[PDB]
């Protein structure tokens, strides 16, 4: 389930589909909020893929299957210089027998950085955590405490009155 | 080379040496070693893509946007041609240089 290639959608289909996935998760109040101001088939495929499971799709899964046309046109463009330079690099660079010494590899681990050879998934995200509800922002705007009396008045200080003679 | 660099830096850190030459030599060796490691790290970053995934970046940007709009932050504008404090900021910068 790793080798599967993304399908090359057209751009405005890709961005429109991408924009929908973000809005359904990080800006859930956007569609309703559009109405107060005034007053394609791809996204249908994504919903129908897992109609049984109500879990909305994520940004990663959308881009793990759907990719734009330029992001897929650029890949073939860059695959040519890699495959073209392969031939360029390979041309630029009784009885008894003779000595044999080691094995030769064009890329060393001493002069060039080597390759890689070593359940791995985590970091769930709360979408509601990314914004502040209007109800909460109302609460943290209301002054409220026990007012402490000033030490002195017009003439008691610390409560005990200033004594006259009379 | 690397073993000698390790040994001499540990000796310098403890405080066993007073040579100026040894300190300079070891500073050069460590600078070279750190630069080799850093160059490899940049190469690996280009190879292995952005370590922060798309989901993390979107969440970070969204939370920062919500925080900024909660405080009604007014974005900083480009310094206009008719800016009152241009000379004062300029003179402060020149003094610090």
């Amino acid at each position: 389930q790793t080798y599967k290639k993304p399908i090359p959608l057209e751009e405005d289909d890709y961005i429109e589909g991408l924009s929908y996935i973000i809005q359904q998760q990080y800006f859930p109040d956007l569609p309703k909020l559009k109405a107060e101001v005034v007053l394609l088939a791809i996204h249908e495929i994504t919903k129908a893929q897992l109609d049984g499971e109500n879990k909305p799709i994520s940004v990663a899964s959308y881009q793990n299957k759907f990719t734009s046309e330029d992001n897929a046109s650029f890949g073939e463009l860059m695959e040519d210089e890699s495959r073209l330079r392969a031939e360029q690099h390979k041309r630029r660079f009784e009885k008894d027998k003779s000595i044999k010494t080691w094995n030769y590899q064009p890329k060393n681990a001493l002069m060039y950085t080597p390759e890689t050879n070593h359940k791995k998934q985590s970091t769930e995200i709360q979408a509601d955590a990314t914004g502040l509800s209007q109800s909460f922002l109302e609460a943290a705007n209301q002054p409220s405490t026990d007012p402490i009396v000033p030490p002195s008045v017009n003439a008691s200080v610390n409560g005990y009155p200033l004594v006259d003679v009379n | 080379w690397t073993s000698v660099a390790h040994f001499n830096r540990e000796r310098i850190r403890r405080g066993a040496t007073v040579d100026k030459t040894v300190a300079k030599k070891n500073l050069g060796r460590l600078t070279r070693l750190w630069l080799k490691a850093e160059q490899e790290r940049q190469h690996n970053y280009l190879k292995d893509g952005p370590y922060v995934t798309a989901d993390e970046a979107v969440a970070i940007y969204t939370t920062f946007v919500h925080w900024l709009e909660s405080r009604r932050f007014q974005p900083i504008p480009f310094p206009p041609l008719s800016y009152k404090h241009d000379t004062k900021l300029l003179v402060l910068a020149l003094e610090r240089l």
Binding site: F27, L30, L33, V37 | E69
Partner: peptide, 28 residues
């Protein structure tokens, strides 16, 4: 989203101001 919410907030403030104007006319 921010620009839409700003429009909605300013329009709700306009609603408050116009209804306050209506209430001040009604008190008269």
């Amino acid at each position: 989203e921010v620009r839409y919410r700003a429009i909605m907030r300013q329009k709700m403030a306009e609603k408050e101001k116009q209804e306050k104007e209506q209430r001040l006319f009604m008190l008269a």
